[PDB]
Amino acid sequence: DLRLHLLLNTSVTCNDGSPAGYYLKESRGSRRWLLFLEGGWYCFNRENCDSRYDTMRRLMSSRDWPRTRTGTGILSSQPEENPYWWNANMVFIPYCSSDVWSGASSKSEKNEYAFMGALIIQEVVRELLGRGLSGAKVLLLAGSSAGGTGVLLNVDRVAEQLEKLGYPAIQVRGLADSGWFLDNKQYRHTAPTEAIRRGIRYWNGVVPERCRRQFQEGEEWNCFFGYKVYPTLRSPVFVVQWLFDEAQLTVDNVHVQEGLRLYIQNLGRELRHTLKDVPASFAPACLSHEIIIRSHWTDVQVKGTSLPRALHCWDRSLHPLKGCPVHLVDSCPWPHCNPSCPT
Ligand SMILES: C#CCOc1ccccc1CCCCCC(=O)O
Numbered sequence: 441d442l443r444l445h446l447l448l449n450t451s452v453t454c455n456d457g458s459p460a461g462y463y464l465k466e467s468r469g470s471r472r473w474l475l476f477l478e479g480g481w482y483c484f485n486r487e488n489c490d491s492r493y494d495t496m497r498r499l500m501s502s503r504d505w506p507r508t509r510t511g512t513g514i515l516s517s518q519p520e521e522n523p524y525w526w527n528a529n530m531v532f533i534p535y536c537s538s539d540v541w542s543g544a545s546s547k548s549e550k551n552e553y554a555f556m557g558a559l560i561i562q563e564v565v566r567e568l569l570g571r572g573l574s575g576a577k578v579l580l581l582a583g584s585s586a587g588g589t590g591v592l593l594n595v596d597r598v599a600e601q602l603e604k605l606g607y608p609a610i611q612v613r614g615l616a617d618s619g620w621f622l623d624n625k626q627y628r629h630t631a632p633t634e635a636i637r638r639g640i641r642y643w644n645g646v647v648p649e650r651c652r653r654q655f656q657e658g659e660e661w662n663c664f665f666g667y668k669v670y671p672t673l674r675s676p677v678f679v680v681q682w683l684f685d686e687a688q689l690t691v692d693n694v695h696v697q698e699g700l701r702l703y704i705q706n707l708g709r710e711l712r713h714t715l716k717d718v719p720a721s722f723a724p725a726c727l728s729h730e731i732i733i734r735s736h737w738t739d740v741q742v743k744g745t746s747l748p749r750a751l752h753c754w755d756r757s758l759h760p761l762k763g764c765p766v767h768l769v770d771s772c773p774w775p776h777c778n779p780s781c782p783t
């Protein structure tokens with residue numbers, strides 16, 4: 441079990457002003473630290489944040505959080521469930537800022553909600569250093585769905601924070617799961633680009649510095665899309681992305697005749713193309729959503745290699761490897777053409 445710690449700096453808050461926090465399970469002797477960012481969509485104005493507060497309140501407040509959480513998948517300490525990092529120090533950072541981990545805005549008389557995701561990560565890292573993180577050799581910042589996009593938005597800031605704090609030996613890396621989206625045409629029209637554009641203004645959202653300087657003022661929404669922000673990043677980032685992500689299909693209004701068949705096949709081809717120059721990636725041809733904290737995340741394979749093995753091969757590459765690949769992207773063009781896809 442991972443044990444809850446609310447942030448000692450109580451000015452770093454969830455949406456409703458309650459303290460943010462993290463769940464921790466230490467592993468003495470291990471110098472690996474895994475900080476996992478939870479996902480869960482987002483909200484982009486007062487009205488729809490109010491709706492989220494009614495029925496998704498745990499994603500906006502810590503007042504009802506449980507004292508413990510079971511580590512599952514890559515957060516599991518059992519080697520059978522987690523062949524990759526079962527002996528690592530485990531951190532689960534709840535997503536209670538509804539801002540894709542980009543905000544740096546306090547609740548005040550002008551703001552009904554605080555959007556502090558980017559500051560929450562920084563404060564967790566800061567407080568963890570006093571609990572053993574100072575002795576780390578590797579800090580893997582991982583995350584799923586909105587948490588996976590959050591990895592892309594925050595990994596370089598974490599590396600910069602530790603550098604300026606005097607810990608240049610800690611290697612910061614990223615693992616972005618199901619957070620790699622396309623700003624594509626909808627299958628049936630009425631969208632992420634505008635909701636994200638409105639979100640950033642609403643959250644005072646921040647994006648990585650090099651990407652911000654490329655796209656410049658008003659266009660920072662571009663940096664929420666993996667294939668645009670990833671080439672600007674200096675930290676190593678491993679990208680896990682279903683070719684037919686359910687969240688991608690949802691926003692594309694896809695729920696089979698030729699038009700939809702072509703739309704789906706093109707979506708997979710486009711995703712494949714964006715990963716062509718991502719050297720550490722795992723991208724199966726499945727219709728699914730999230731993987732790395734699922735208990736059976738060991739089951740899926742691309743070209744015969746599981747995701748836990750691909751991540752271990754990535755670790756070895758950061759010391760091509762014979763029989764230890766790190767770039768694993770399915771080429772078949774339809775969901776479940778890969779036989780190991782989840783049922
Ligand atoms: C296309 C699309 C989805 O829109 C986004 C685009 C770019 C970055 C982030 C998002 C939202 C991520 C939500 C994922 C679902 C979840 O968090 O469970």
Ligand SMILES: *[C@@H]1O[C@H](CO)[C@@H](O)[C@H](O)[C@H]1NC(C)=O
Nearest residue numbers: 449450451452559560562563
């Ligand atoms: C608490 O967090 C805020 C927001 O990041 C920061 O400005 C302030 O310096 C922090 N205070 C302490 C004592 O860490």
